[PDB]
Design a protein around this ligand. Structure first.
Ligand SMILES: Nc1ncnc2c1ncn2[C@H]1C[C@H](O)[C@@H](COP(=O)(O)OP(=O)(O)OP(=O)(O)O)O1
Ligand code: SF4
Ligand SMILES: [Mg+2]
Lengths: 187, 869
DNA sequence: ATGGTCGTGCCGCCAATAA
């Protein structure tokens, strides 16, 4: 279903800011750390991508990093296949829940994964939202919620005033759920 | 009466065939012939000894009931007399009570108690090892060997002069020796000490095989040997090393000798005999061995391939009197160093490869490498397949014979230069075991025999034979970087033996039942282990004192260094044997305690040195590196002396010395550093000598080109030049190396990589991913000379074009120029052999990085870092 | 058939739980 020519548009329109930042980092640096790689692979599996297209996209992006295909094949192809439950125990995996991304495995230096509303600094988040044509009132509300230790409802309000809807109508527990709810209204 | 002296050299026994007898071979003195000849003596009526531990209270074999009557010695005597003897058919025995001390791991045994010592001939059967009874709780020494019992009873420590009392003639000869003797009981043998050892006879030989083309089989076609008749074990090697020689050559089968070969032999006029078939050559060699009667046989790879092939050829050819190779008369030989040792009974076998491996560490242990290193000469290697081609010309056959003779001469020269025989004799005389077993290598046997002698001499009972695990050393956290000021290094002399002597660590003193036992009380007397290690420590100190003598020959200094290193290794192996699970004296707690004490000593020394406002940057379980941050040798020397005095004030037996003073040190990681060592010469002047420790350059699994580049980089870095010029020099050298590699002017011999084999090549399940095992498989399947465990394999990675991985594209060096589709893979060597070593070496210094190295080498930097545009 | 501690190069394997 999903092709390679609309993933960028989907990230800019439907993806939450965390995975949008991960996609931008993968596009620019042509590389990612283990946390970002795992999160992006699980999300791409969740949205509906199969093994062939995911492998094609990953190898094409790695070519943009300028390492030989053999290196990628013997280094990370096994990990990608195991992420889909196609090797080892052959156990299918669930994409990381929003609660785990917010709390579990916090990012470190050089890591772009995790919740920006909890990990990314507010001062850089201001220009990040400016790049996302976010209204100043929404930015102030998001900052106030962040100062109030509110992350799930903060992303809920973010989805609300980026989706031109007053009420989202769901409880935020999964970025895959976020994308599905965004697509249910957009499409 | 009648009595004759004797000098034994070897022993042999066979419980299964002739129980209760020991054969001794050696030299005897004859006045009429004014020379020493081989002799053998038989000792019989060797009887087993048993020790029965009486029980303080008898217990029934059903519920352990104690009636109330105390147990007397006569009760145990009656129990053995009327119960054990009848059941196991024991006819005659002698019994008497004695006193013994037991201090080993077996529990429920008092330290001092009486035992029932019963002796009977070995002909009667053997009691079970775990026998139990109404009045005795345990039995010791059920399965003691006859040879060991004889040696411990007569207190014989290695070769020595022996006196036989009341000799008896033999009705039927049993050995190929000139003189024979017989002793009824071992009580008639005595040892003397004030006689110098007699001269011996040394025989060196080697052969050249030939693989049959029609069927998979090997035959011997040429052979030569060298004999010396007055070799002395108490002096230097004689000059010349040999006095006589002989050689014999025979055709394999189908090929015939070139015409007029006998005329050429007569023209040359050398002691060479041409043999018709293989059987004639084998018979001639067997007769020659008996006629010469050698005492030491020295060769290369004798235990691995030579002896087995020779015995197999003798068997298949059915040569008469196969026993002439040994010194005993037998009919059927065994087959598997056990079968070979049994076959060569009576004659000492010395292998140059084993001795070289035990003494000197080299890149490889082939004959060519040994000649190149020890003798600094090159040896021409004749390809195995070309043997058939060179069999049609007289000149080629003569060249082959001369090459065999040269190989024998090289083996003899290497053996004489390494001084293996005097060192082995000294080690045997120290330990007290059989000297022929010493030449086979190994450290467990020597330590076991030494401890056995020590415990037997002190009236103890030794345990019967059989049928990571704890905290070790401590290494401090290094301070990675580059240092320019003078750096000290303090070392401990014989740390573990010193700790053992200081803290009286011994079996008798330490009470034990994963916990470290407490230290023994200082009021207790010295244990057996410290008193036995003190002799080795004193011997090493004496050797070092002899070293300190000035104006010595360069070869004598090297021989003394080898001797002292061997002595130090032997002394150190005593501690290691305490942690050997298969050892006869296995004791983990003692090793744990000594390691803990060493760690505590290191910590205390480090803390007390830090207390004096000095920087400590490294240390490995006995050392401390101090950054004095000075530039004059006098001040650092005075500070080192002060610290040495402060350290040595605390202890009584431990000592500390200034091992060396560095001028500049580059520390990379743990056990990996390189520095310049300052050595004074005269008039207060000093010279600097480079040295390496643990770097990737000193390893044998790297190509020589990478090693040379790393050595040059290390030499340039440690120099005193400005930091700006060294970067330019390294860049220029790397550019030149990159240009030369792609140009193809580099010799092929610089791309060889050497690796060792642990197991047999057929035992590797990952043969598809291991290159060295693949090359070993290829050379075994399609080649001649066979590679086994412990051998080294040389391989080169070449471009194959099959789109396979690097690990599956290994080939033998001889396979490269033979074919046409194989070429040197320059990319692999320039990107995975040179770059990693240089990048790791130059990591601590600034101005050099992986990207810069890649650019200088001419590679593609678009893989290492890039990414950021 | 001595003990332990340390690093370098090849491979395969795993996490996950909405709707
Ligand atoms: N090959 C070995 N086998 C067993 N233990 C060893 C071995 N090498 C070293 N050790 C142990 C015991 C030593 O006391 C300790 C330190 O050894 P090392 O520094 O080489 O020499 P050493 O402290 O015994 O004195 P020396 O400097 O006089 O040779 O490490
Ligand atoms: S709340 Fe969840 S979906 Fe929203 S930015 Fe944070 S991690 Fe992403
Ligand atoms: Mg990786």
């Amino acid at each position: 279903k999903i092709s390679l020519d609309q993933i960028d548009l989907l990230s800019t329109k439907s993806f939450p800011p965390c995975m949008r930042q991960l996609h931008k980092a993968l596009r620019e640096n042509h590389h990612l750390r283990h946390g970002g790689r795992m999160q992006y692979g699980l999300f791409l599996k969740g949205i509906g991508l199969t093994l062939e297209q995911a492998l094609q996209f990953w190898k094409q992006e790695f070519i943009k990093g300028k390492m030989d295909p053999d290196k990628f094949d013997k280094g990370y192809s096994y990990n990608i296949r195991h992420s889909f439950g196609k090797e080892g125990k052959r156990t299918d995996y669930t994409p990381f829940s929003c609660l785990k991304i917010i709390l579990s495995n916090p990012p470190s230096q050089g890591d772009y994964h995790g919740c920006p509303f909890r990990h990314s600094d507010p001062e850089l988040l201001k220009q990040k939202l400016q790049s996302y044509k976010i209204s100043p009132g929404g930015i102030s509300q998001i900052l106030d919620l962040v100062k109030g230790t509110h992350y799930q409802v903060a992303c809920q309000k973010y989805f609300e005033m980026i989706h031109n809807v007053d009420d989202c109508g769901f409880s935020l527990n999964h970025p895959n759920q976020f994308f599905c709810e965004s697509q249910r209204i957009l499409n | 009466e009648q009595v004759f002296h004797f000098y034994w050299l070897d022993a042999y026994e066979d419980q299964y065939n002739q129980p209760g007898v020991v054969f001794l071979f050696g030299k005897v003195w004859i006045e009429s012939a004014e020379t020493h000849v081989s002799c053998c003596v038989m000792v019989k009526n060797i009887e087993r000894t048993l020790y029965f531990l009486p029980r303080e209270m008898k217990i029934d074999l059903n519920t352990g009931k104690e009636t109330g009557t105390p147990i007397s010695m006569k009760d145990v005597y009656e129990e053995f007399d009327e119960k054990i003897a009848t059941k196991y058919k024991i006819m005659k025995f002698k019994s008497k009570p004695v006193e013994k001390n037991y201090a080993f791991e077996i529990p429920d045994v008092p330290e001092k108690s009486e035992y029932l010592e019963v002796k009977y001939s070995a002909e009667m059967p053997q009691l079970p090892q775990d026998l139990k009874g109404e009045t005795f709780s345990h039995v010791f020494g059920t399965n003691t060997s006859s040879l060991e019992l004889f040696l411990m009873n007569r207190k014989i420590k290695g070769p020595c002069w022996l006196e036989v009392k009341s000799p008896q003639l033999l009705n039927q000869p049993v050995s190929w020796c000139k003189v024979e003797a017989m002793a009824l009981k071992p009580d008639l043998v005595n040892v003397i000490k004030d006689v110098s050892p007699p001269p011996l006879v040394v025989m060196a030989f080697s052969m050249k095989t030939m693989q049959n083309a029609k069927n998979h089989q090997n035959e011997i076609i040429a052979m030569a040997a060298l004999v010396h008749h007055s070799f002395a074990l108490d002096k230097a090697a004689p000059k010349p090393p040999f006095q006589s020689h002989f050689c014999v050559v025979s055709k394999p089968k189908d090929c015939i000798f070139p015409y007029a070969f006998k005329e050429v032999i007569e023209k040359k006029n050398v002691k060479v005999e041409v043999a018709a078939t293989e059987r004639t050559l084998l018979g001639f060699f067997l007769a020659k061995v008996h006629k010469i009667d050698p005492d030491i046989i020295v060769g290369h790879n004798i235990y691995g391939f030579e002896l087995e092939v020779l015995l197999q050829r003798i068997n298949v050819c059915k040569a008469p009197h196969w026993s002439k190779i040994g010194r005993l008369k037998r009919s059927n030989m065994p087959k598997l160093g056990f079968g070979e040792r049994n076959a060569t009974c009576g004659r000492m076998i010395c292998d140059v490869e084993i001795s070289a491996k035990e003494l000197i560490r080299c890149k490889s242990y082939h004959l060519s490498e040994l000649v190149q290193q020890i003798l600094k000469t090159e040896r021409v290697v004749i390809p195995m397949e070309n043997i058939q081609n060179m069999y049609s010309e007289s000149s080629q056959l003569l060249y082959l014979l001369e090459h065999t003779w040269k190989d024998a001469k090289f083996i003899l020269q290497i053996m004489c230069e390494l001084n293996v025989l005097p060192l082995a004799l000294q080690i045997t005389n120290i330990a007290g075991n059989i000297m022929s077993r010493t030449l086979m290598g190994g450290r467990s046997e020597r330590n076991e025999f030494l401890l056995l002698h020590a415990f037997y001499e002190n009236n103890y009972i030794v345990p019967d034979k059989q049928i990571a695990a704890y905290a070790g050393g401590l290494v401090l956290d290094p301070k990675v970087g580059f240092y320019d000021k003078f750096i000290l290094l303090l070392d401990f002399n014989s740390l573990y033996p010193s700790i053992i002597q200081e803290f009286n660590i011994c079996f008798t003193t330490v009470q034990r039942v994963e916990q470290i036992p407490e230290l023994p009380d200082p009021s207790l007397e010295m244990g057996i282990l410290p008193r036995e290690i003190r002799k080795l420590v004193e011997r090493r100190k004496q050797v070092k004192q002899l070293m300190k003598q000035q104006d010595l020959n360069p070869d004598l200094i090297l021989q003394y260094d080898i001797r002292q290193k061997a002595l130090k290794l032997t002394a150190n192996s005593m501690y290691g044997c305490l942690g050997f699970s298969y050892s006869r004296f296995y004791a983990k707690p003692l090793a744990a305690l000594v390691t803990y004490k060493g760690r505590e000593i290191l910590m205390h020394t480090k803390e007390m040195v830090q207390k004096m406002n000095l920087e400590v940057i490294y240390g490995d379980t006995d050392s401390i590196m101090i950054n004095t941050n000075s530039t004059n040798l006098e001040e650092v020397f005075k500070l080192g002396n002060k610290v040495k005095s402060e350290v040595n004030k605390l202890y009584k037996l431990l000592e500390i010395d200034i091992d060396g003073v560095f001028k500049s040190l580059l520390l990379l990681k743990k056990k990996k550093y390189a520095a310049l060592v300052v050595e004074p010469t005269s008039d207060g002047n000093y010279v600097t000598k480079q040295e390496l420790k643990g770097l990737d350059i000193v390893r044998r699994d790297w190509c020589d080109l990478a090693k040379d580049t790393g050595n040059f980089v290390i030499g340039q870095i440690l120099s005193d030049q400005s930091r700006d010029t060294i970067v330019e020099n390294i860049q220029k050298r790397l550019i030149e190396i990159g240009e030369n590699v792609l140009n193809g002017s580099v010799p092929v011999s610089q791309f060889e990589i050497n690796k060792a084999l642990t197991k047999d090549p057929q035992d590797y399940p990952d043969k598809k991913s291991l290159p060295h095992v693949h090359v070993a498989l290829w050379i075994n399947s399609q080649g001649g000379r066979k590679v086994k465990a412990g051998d080294t394999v040389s391989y080169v990675i070449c471009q194959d074009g099959s789109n396979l991985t690097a690990s599956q594209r290994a080939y033998a060096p001889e396979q490269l120029q033979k074919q046409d589709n194989l070429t040197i893979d320059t990319q692999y060597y320039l990107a995975q052999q040179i770059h990693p070593v240089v990048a790791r070496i130059c990591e601590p210094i600034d101005g050099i990085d992986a990207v810069l190295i890649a650019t200088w080498l001419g590679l593609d930097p678009t893989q290492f870092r890039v990414h950021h545009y």
